[PDB]
Amino acid sequence: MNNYIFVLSSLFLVGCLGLALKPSPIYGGLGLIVSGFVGCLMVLGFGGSFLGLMVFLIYLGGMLVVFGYTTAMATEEYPETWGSNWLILGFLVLGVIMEVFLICVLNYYDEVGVINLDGLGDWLMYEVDDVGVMLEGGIGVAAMYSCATWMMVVAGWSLFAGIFIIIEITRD
Amino acid sequence: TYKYVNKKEQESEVDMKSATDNAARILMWTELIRGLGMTLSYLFREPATINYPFEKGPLSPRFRGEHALRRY
């Protein structure tokens, strides 16, 4: 349980390695769901909750749409998978070797600075109001309705304008 | 002689009494509730099933079935 966060961030890393090799967008959309889920679990481990579930919710609807677009516009006869091509399969395997090397190396020349394998877990939560009541990330995110109302104006306008933007882009 | 199945355009005027009826039909799904009622009534009818092979469907003396050679 002391390696818990380290493993989640290691899984997150691979999900973006697989994503970077860019197989068929059917599988690229599968990596984003698993990285989205892994990343959701990290924000939960560090004490978040609302921020964890939102990024998971939002990326679940994004890949639903992306799936619909893949089957219509980004599909070929023989979709590529991570094992489909020997060269990509090489860099996915090799990519995992490198991290096992970079972590081991960089851990050797500093021991604490970057990667402190000797002390995984000791430094996850720094402080925490033990007798607190109002500490959920939802309260911080909810400040957009009172304190950082400017955040919401630009966010709302961004989405409002976007409807006009896409309707014109796609127009016949 | 002929009749119209789907002609009714002897247009009337939408009274406030009648408009509120159209809206309740649309918002309250009234005709869809009537259909739910018809299948509920059938739930409490006796099924038409017969207990085959212990019960048999009726047949008449003319029934054309398997062949046979008769004698005197």
Binding site: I33, F50, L53, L57, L64, V65, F67 | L43, R45, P47
Partner: protein, 318 residues
């Protein structure tokens, strides 16, 4: 003692799921003027177990054109998420107590759409791809309104905790101050669970069987167990949210018994609905949800934002 507590959740649910298949076939029967199963066991009670055993002795299919990794993953995901939706449900005390249970239900439900998508896409067949692209269309239809409806109801509740709905409904069902959202909520759950008149991903009439046309045997059994578990859960969730069962801190057995009666009754209405209506066209499902429900849901969201403000009825945070 926690493992024993999983047993008394995942096993009763799975048994209750199976008999829902029997209740479905007999209620549909008598509504159609026939008897449904009644030979395999006393009144068919063994019919569910026969179908299960037969399906797991049926040869499983590995089509030559299929993408096997996702072909297998998809049914496994389907049944996992169906069982996982249950662990937060308070009845009246949940197995797993989550602060944001409602989001866990929303997020788990969405992720289960990918079992339809991946299976259909992985089958590499035209009818299974038609079924998958209806799952995409069906989700785009009901997702936006379903979340906002929950938001409206939870502004009378105060939080995303499911266990706090028990306390909100201590003196009254939320069905009364919220029957417009319950009406829209109920129709969403029929769309969420691919139930008639919204069985568009399967839709035997138009698509031979939709997304699971290439599935036979035990892998196809897992998809169904998932479909019928979700029916109970979505109606169980609707019973907690809108039809709050009686809760006395001294009689937790009362809440469960009342909770079950209303969950069974709502589950029946799914079977009642399937026997009564024709199937929607999946383009018309979008128009129903975007041109009727969504305009009403936004107005009710704005109604229920203001409503606690001008009655000084803000729910407590805890």
């Amino acid at each position: 003692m926690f493992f024993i507590n999983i047993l008394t959740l995942l096993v009763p649910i799975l048994i209750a799921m199976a008999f829902l298949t029997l209740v479905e076939r007999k209620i549909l029967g008598y509504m159609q003027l026939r008897k449904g199963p009644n030979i395999v066991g006393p009144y068919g009670i063994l019919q569910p177990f026969a179908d299960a055993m037969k399906l797991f002795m049926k040869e499983p299919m590995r089509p030559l054109t299929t993408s096997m990794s996702l072909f297998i993953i998809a049914p496994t995901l389907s049944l996992t998420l169906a069982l996982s939706l249950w662990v937060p449900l308070p009845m009246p005390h949940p197995l797993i107590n989550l602060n944001l249970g409602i989001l866990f239900i929303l997020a788990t439900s969405s992720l289960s759409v990918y079992s339809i998508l991946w299976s259909g896409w992985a089958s590499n067949s035209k009818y299974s791809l038609f079924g998958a692209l209806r799952a995409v269309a069906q989700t785009i239809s009901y997702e936006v309104t379903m979340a906002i409806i929950l938001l409206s109801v939870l502004l009378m509740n105060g939080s995303y905790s499911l266990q706090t709905l028990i306390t909100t409904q201590e003196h009254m069902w939320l069905l009364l101050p919220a029957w417009p959202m319950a009406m829209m909520w109920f129709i969403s759950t029929l769309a969420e669970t691919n139930r008639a008149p919204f069985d568009l991903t399967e839709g035997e009439s138009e698509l031979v069987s939709g997304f699971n046309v290439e599935y036979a045997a035990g892998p196809f059994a897992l998809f169904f167990m998932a479909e019928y578990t979700n029916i109970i859960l979505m109606n169980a969730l609707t019973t907690i949210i809108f039809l709050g069962p009686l809760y006395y801190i001294n009689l937790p057995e009362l809440y469960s018994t009342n909770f079950m009666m209303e969950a069974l009754l709502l589950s029946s209405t799914f079977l009642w609905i399937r026997a009564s209506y024709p199937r929607f066209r999946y383009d018309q499902l979008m128009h129903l949800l975007w041109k009727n429900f969504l305009p009403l849901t936004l107005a009710l969201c704005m109604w229920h934002i203001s409503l606690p403000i001008f009655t000084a009825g803000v729910p407590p945070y805890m």
